Design a protein around this ligand. Sequence first.
Ligand SMILES: [Zn+2]
Ligand SMILES: [Zn+2]
Ligand SMILES: [Zn+2]
Ligand SMILES: [Zn+2]
Lengths: 327, 328
Amino acid sequence: RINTVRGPITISEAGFTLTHEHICGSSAGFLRAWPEFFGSRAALVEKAVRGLRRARAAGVRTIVDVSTFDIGRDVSLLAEVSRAADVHIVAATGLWEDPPLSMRLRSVEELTQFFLREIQYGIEDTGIRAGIIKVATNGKATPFQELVLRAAARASLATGVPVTTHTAASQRDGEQQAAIFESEGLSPSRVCIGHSDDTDDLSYLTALAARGYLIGLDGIPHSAIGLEDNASASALLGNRSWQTRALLIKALIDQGYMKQILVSNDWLFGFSSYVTNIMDVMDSVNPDGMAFIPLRVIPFLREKGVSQETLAGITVTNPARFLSPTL
Amino acid sequence: DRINTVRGPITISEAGFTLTHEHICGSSAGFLRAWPEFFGSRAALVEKAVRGLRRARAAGVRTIVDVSTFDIGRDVSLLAEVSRAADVHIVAATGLWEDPPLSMRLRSVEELTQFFLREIQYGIEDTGIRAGIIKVATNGKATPFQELVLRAAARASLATGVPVTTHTAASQRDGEQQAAIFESEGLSPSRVCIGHSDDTDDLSYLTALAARGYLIGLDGIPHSAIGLEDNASASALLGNRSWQTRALLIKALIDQGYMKQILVSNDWLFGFSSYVTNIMDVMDSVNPDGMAFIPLRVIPFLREKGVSQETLAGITVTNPARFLSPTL
Ligand SMILES: [Zn+2]
Ligand SMILES: [Zn+2]
Ligand SMILES: [Zn+2]
Ligand SMILES: [Zn+2]
């Protein structure tokens, strides 16, 4: 049984499940401290609930919100949005690209206790528990990032919740990640290598798939084609098309790794950890928001020969098996 | 001429004896809320800061300026709570210290100015507590962003009248480069305390500034790791100059004639998460007085070296209150 922000639910209550989404991409404390940045706090919470409603109209029953502490995971703001839309939300624990000083100077012993705090006891005074552990690298692991992986693996072994990881896929990051993970004795089935549609090296994915790992093609609408005037927007979203990412799903089923795909949008309704008005530009690319998966990518795949049977396994069965704890 | 503490405004005269650089907690933003167990509990941290705050009250302190910014983890409801309990005025801080996260770092100088003025004019968070001072920092040659932070902090101060205090690596003559940016923005040296300057011995560097009109913050008087050379992490934080060696810098800056531009404080704290673990264990036994070290051990030291009580009173009451009075 899975922990959501509104309590525990059973495996089959989950349904069609986006497995890497954000409500707001921010920093810790930024939302409390400068909420005019997003218009107002209520201005943003409306923007999420409009956008979540649109996906729940499209069949989505659960999102996994992989914002960690250093992304500003306002776990109350989540459960606010989760009532008003009737979408389960699974919150995350862990650490992203930007930990603060009070994190960086901790030992792998200390980080393991904090990770188990938010899985076993609760995120802040709020009593909500996290069902997934997010971690991150961009290239070679820094010594701290190395600690984070081992602490998240030692956490994932006392609790059974899985690990999802941020990756710069162009530099075969999952390889080092999985090397570090397996050194701690974590089953490759308890780990999704994320941001993996950012590469075109299929051999790297299928090699990683074949050791047992789950592959996050969680970036399907991230494309800055049409924004070759925005320098920063092109940097954040890559020059590969959405169909280019989407086809890598079919290509990975073809190698007989349907059992191992998770698909998601990596969308967000507030974005402060990048240049200003980046959210202005991203919403014009993709008005559908988080609804881009059931409205545009599921039709596109049925148009390329993927039946409703295996689509339903990827969107319902795979996240169900992946989020259920396992000792 | 009123100043904003965390329990509403007060008048200049109400300030009294004032430590112009202190911390209740040295942390990062929401670290306290997220992992209170690192400090024992949120209760346990509040007990310990009130205890130390009453010890300094009984030695005669009324007002401390807690200069923790957003990224030192400035919990103003926490600060308001220990101000109620220990009957001590606490001025709160806006600005950006050594560790700004992504959502500040990507901001322009215009935006950062909108943010400082928000914490000065409107309030901090949803609490409606207003800041009385803008803290910024460099170590060495300013990063381009540190130039953006100094310039926006300077634009707020001209727009509001609140002073700017700073953190420096004194040994590298930072106050030279801070001052050049400040004065390039139209800001009066009277509005800027160049701090952490008892971490140098280059006396002519302090005097060169102080003549240009700046205030000089001697804000780490019991920082010294003497007798703690085997602890390499502690020796890095506190340095190897004893506390007498710093306390002399006061008397030596009085003498040069600059009694009016001298602010004195501890840079103490009751919870420290943004350094190695158990560093708070070490610091509390170097100095059991805590924030009381300036009334209890540095004041009697200076009178034995022959400073006039009328000069001491101006240093701790006339000097802070002139700094914190808003001036457009
Ligand atoms: Zn990511
Ligand atoms: Zn993400
Ligand atoms: Zn400092
Ligand atoms: Zn300080």
